Design a protein around this ligand. Structure first.
Ligand SMILES: NC(=O)c1ccc[n+]([C@@H]2O[C@H](COP(=O)([O-])OP(=O)(O)OC[C@H]3O[C@@H](n4cnc5c(N)ncnc54)[C@H](O)[C@@H]3O)[C@@H](O)[C@H]2O)c1
Ligand SMILES: NC(=O)c1ccc[n+]([C@@H]2O[C@H](COP(=O)([O-])OP(=O)(O)OC[C@H]3O[C@@H](n4cnc5c(N)ncnc54)[C@H](O)[C@@H]3O)[C@@H](O)[C@H]2O)c1
Ligand SMILES: NC(=O)c1ccc[n+]([C@@H]2O[C@H](COP(=O)([O-])OP(=O)(O)OC[C@H]3O[C@@H](n4cnc5c(N)ncnc54)[C@H](O)[C@@H]3O)[C@@H](O)[C@H]2O)c1
Ligand SMILES: NC(=O)c1ccc[n+]([C@@H]2O[C@H](COP(=O)([O-])OP(=O)(O)OC[C@H]3O[C@@H](n4cnc5c(N)ncnc54)[C@H](O)[C@@H]3O)[C@@H](O)[C@H]2O)c1
Lengths: 317, 317, 317, 317
């Protein structure tokens, strides 16, 4: 019997509200906006409900403070976080958000244990690992949104240099969602043309490539410093929706995200940004990029960052 | 010559940013986000720019505080306003927002005087009238967003009662965007069936229609009371986009909006909520609904409330 | 566990192929194109498959001659028919297509008895009734596409007169899909304005309305006489997809279609064109239009046509 | 002034009608369907017109046999051809179709000389060269659809092997649209990973790549053999629309098409399959792929086959 698709958004702040907005606009699923703050999800849900007829969507969007309402959710997107932007590093939110995810894990485990969980809450890679351990959900049904955002930024900056449609730039960011993230320049192409060729042709310099890599790594601060009252939320929301689409429509889409990687990239069981295939069984495979020796080292340094913050969490107050 | 469509969003707050998000997502046009507040429009533009590749759109979205950047704009959407939500009525911000729109009027007059202008700034009907006077733009190239939002709520509430797709409800709200808005119950139809028939069939009572009419007029408060930090912004943004679409696509679409009504509804030249036809020449026509004596009276009261508040603004002490 | 939606198209001729094309384009479902003609569905499926990447859809489209391949189909759309356009009346195909539907009913009953069946095969209303009797599927899970096509034509012609967007014209055609079909002028509106008002305003004449009614009734011949090699197929395909959308997305959409009507319009168990609500349980309700005495008589004459052709079939060779 | 976009489709057969269908569905532009055959374009235009309200599009679609009706066309797409499918090679219809394109050239030269012209008529590369010469239109405003169709098939077949979304495969086909097309295997990547890496990882063999390359070159026959009444038309139509989109939306999109290559791939001025950048000024650039010695040679052979057949047409007996 046909049932409507259902996405639960845990945390109805800046990102959560836009996710509901976009999901509703696309008629991808019904949405449940969950939050502990009185009135917030209810007001956003009512507002978004009014827009549905304008978009020609019959998606239902409700606000709640009750985990019972996320029962039967196909996808759970976790945006829940302590207030205030990070000053210097995403891991400043580590202790507070780990405790939030403990609570979220109990709600999910009880009401929708078969859901595909997409974590957004920072510090992303550590939070995803934490959520999986506490919730007990299968590794392939729990992942983190990060790579799509980082890679979209990487692709956009390359596209802005060459003056071409970013959809025609292929480019990946891998590793942890932090300073150590690795935009893999070696496997970048624009319409099938690699960066090495554009260098020979005189259309881009290595220094320009290095600036694009740097820009990608610290892009979050550029947005956050301009917004002042918080961090990026339009693109992170859009990225979460693309990931939800891949699962709900069984796309077998190649998606860079934080996934449990245990037989690739020289690691033996860790959550980190890698190119995955996402479909109706969640994370169905991981693909191995052709990394240079330098890039393999940078990835190693990224893995170290993830392990370091993970150990800090294991010795929390 | 093919040129990209260009939409200028004046005021990059809650509604302005959402308009930019959706316009870009749909690839309806390039977007210029204008604001006086430092950082805000640049930050949102950068964030939204990163999402464009996720949506498969090539729309360019930039942020600015320089009116020279809105030149050649096909459409201008004005959300600029002084801070703080309305208490009981929308017409408390009259003098401040009139002052803001003077600057916008001078900006548009200089850099894009052939633009279709859609005002959203409250108090809507007076602001629209004020902008046209100060700007000197043709009456048919200046209107206000209100009816689409109110009609959308009206359609939504009717649809919830009957348990049907709101897209299959036809319903209009006319008059001023305030407590004296007139949801024309006589114009209502659900897939060809009118409310009178549904009463006779016993599928809706007169008391329920009264509640729906009331809900529509006070719906803005229900949202604001729950958001607590401001007024509705997801649905108002979407409404403005639908109006922009009608213009840019030359749809000849029926759009309830605040337009210069010169020879309909017993008025000689006033900006108020009416069902217009919008195409490439702006407001191209106005339709005449079959209003009941009661609805004629309610609209008459609505017309007076506009002129009352309009004359107060003319008498600048 | 998330499974892809599946639509089976029985008959991969002119309409069938476009249905697959559009369903695939929209990524509404996977498609199985069934036909008895060797090579035809396979070639169309391969061709349409190549277009999927161009549309950004991951829909799978296959061609088959084996009813086993329609197992687990959520929706079955029946386009199967004997060759050649009708000369004067759709019922010329009655005897041949009744026998085809006997075969289709066995395939559906065995492999996907829980499917929502949308019949297109002419003579529509009699074929739908025939399919339901032979297949044994519930009345609410078997219907015929016709009203959406007839009403879209009716709406288009009205829209073409007034020079407005047809989406803003509300108008229904009811009764049998034949010469006796009833375009209900009484409940037509354009942006909430009834035709009676446009007559008073001098914008349309009753004779012009009568021509639009006639044009609607014989529209099929206008298309067919121009195509020469067959009858209309672009719009009928689009109409079938809208009906499939309503079921698969649980829209509660108001859809004029041939449905089993037993407590409305003065009939006690007959398939005929009526305004329905379609959702995940198929035909979930029928709505009652406000018909004039003249329109009630015309509907009576339509019912007689349907019964007459139905009796002819009951006394087949 | 906002004006509607306008696309003229010259030749309203299998491909032409599908282009009209999709353009209208997407509301990309108004459509003029031109043909010499009586009734055909009028019938399809009327049929497609009825579907517009179903799709929620206001695109106007008309049929004609008068070149004056294609005036002011932003894009012209040429499908006009003599009847009958190709036997073994596409270059059998040279003289007949060259004669047809003379008429189209004179029509476009008179009524819409600033139009972006996309030729589809076979033999593609020679027809494109012929049309530009006879029409006198700028080289950058005239191109041929081929590479998008071939690249789409190439991407699709690669994607089927790896079991991933074809949209996440980057792959180009260059050279002539014939047996000497060159699927550049060296340009292939699946989410950043190249075929060389997949070979090393043991996820694809060299023999399988050879089969995929072969499948791509002969794919047109597989479709034609199954359709039996003609050649592929769903995917070719969609390809032409994607090219029109790139122009009308000013996408700066990477489009493999038959373009005037003057200073790349070792040629001084010839129409052949190359990766172009298409925007509002037509073909705005050409990208240089890193071809292997073998691929350079295969492309060289392809270039000769164009000039061979091109010189045969220059020598009109
Ligand atoms: N992965 C990424 O790439 C990425 C990108 C941007 C932002 N982020 C992160 O996403 C998170 C959300 O960002 P935002 O701007 O939407 O934050 P926000 O402050 O706007 O929203 C957070 C919401 O979480 C709610 N919340 C707090 N405690 C909760 C609990 N116990 N249960 C449920 N809800 C609770 C709050 O009420 C608030 O509405 C942040 O941690 C941010 O750093 C991640
Ligand atoms: N018509 C309707 O139905 C409707 C519905 C909802 C809200 N509104 C109204 O729309 C307006 C905007 O709502 P919001 O929530 O986006 O407000 P907001 O406070 O979030 O945004 C207003 C923006 O205007 C900017 N601004 C201030 N002075 C300016 C100037 N001189 N030039 C340019 N920009 C300036 C501010 O920096 C701010 O970013 C309000 O007046 C609100 O009452 C109307
Ligand atoms: N309901 C409506 O409003 C409406 C509108 C237009 C057309 N139609 C009808 O739809 C039907 C299809 O029209 P079309 O133009 O697509 O016809 P078509 O001739 O192009 O296609 C019919 C297909 O049915 C196949 N077929 C024949 N016998 C079969 C069997 N036993 N099992 C499976 N398939 C079989 C044929 O091989 C052929 O491919 C016609 O009867 C036509 O009158 C209905
Ligand atoms: N580039 C590619 O990859 C590709 C792929 C498939 C097909 N094709 C080619 O595209 C062309 C069209 O294919 P189709 O299946 O649509 O063919 P079709 O026979 O279905 O349609 C051709 C149309 O051209 C019309 N026509 C004939 N003479 C004309 C004239 N002087 N002016 C205007 N119109 C005229 C005919 O009436 C007919 O409707 C063929 O040449 C085919 O080989 C190219």
């Amino acid at each position: 019997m046909i049932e409507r698709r259902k996405i639960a958004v845990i945390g109805s702040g800046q990102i959560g509200g836009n996710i509901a907005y976009i999901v509703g606009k696309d008629n991808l699923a019904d949405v449940v906006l969950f939050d502990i703050a009185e009135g917030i999800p209810q007001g956003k849900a009512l507002d978004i409900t009014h827009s549905m007829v304008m978009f020609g969507s019959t998606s239902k969007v409700i606000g709640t403070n009750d985990y019972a309402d996320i029962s039967g959710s196909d996808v759970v997107i976790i945006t829940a976080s302590i207030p205030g932007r990070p000053k210097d590093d995403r891991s400043e939110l580590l202790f507070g958000n780990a405790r939030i995810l403990d609570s979220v894990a109990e709600g999910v485990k009880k009401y929708c244990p078969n859901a595909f969980v997409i974590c957004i809450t920072n510090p992303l890679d550590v939070m995803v690992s934490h959520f999986q351990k506490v919730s007990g959900l299968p590794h392939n049904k729990v992942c983190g949104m990060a790579g799509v955002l980082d890679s979209s930024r990487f692709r956009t900056f390359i596209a802005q240099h060459f003056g071409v449609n970013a959809s025609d730039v292929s480019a990946n960011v891998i590793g942890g969602h932090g300073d150590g993230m690795v935009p893999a320049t070696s496997s970048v192409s624009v319409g099938g043309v690699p960066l090495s060729s554009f260098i020979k042709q005189g259309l881009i310099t290595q220094e320009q490539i290095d600036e694009i890599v740097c820009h990608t790594r610290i892009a979050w601060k550029e947005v956050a410093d301009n917004l002042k009252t918080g961090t990026a939320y339009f693109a992170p929301a859009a990225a979460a929706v693309k990931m939800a689409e891949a699962y709900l429509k069984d796309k077998k889409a190649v998606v860079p995200c934080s996934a449990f990687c245990s037989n690739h990239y020289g690691v033996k069981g860790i959550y980190m940004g890698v190119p995955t295939i996402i479909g109706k069984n969640g994370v169905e495979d991981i693909l191995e990029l052709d990394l240079t020796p330098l890039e393999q080292k940078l990835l190693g340094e990224s893995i170290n960052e993830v392990n370091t913050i993970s150990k800090v969490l294991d010795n929390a107050p």
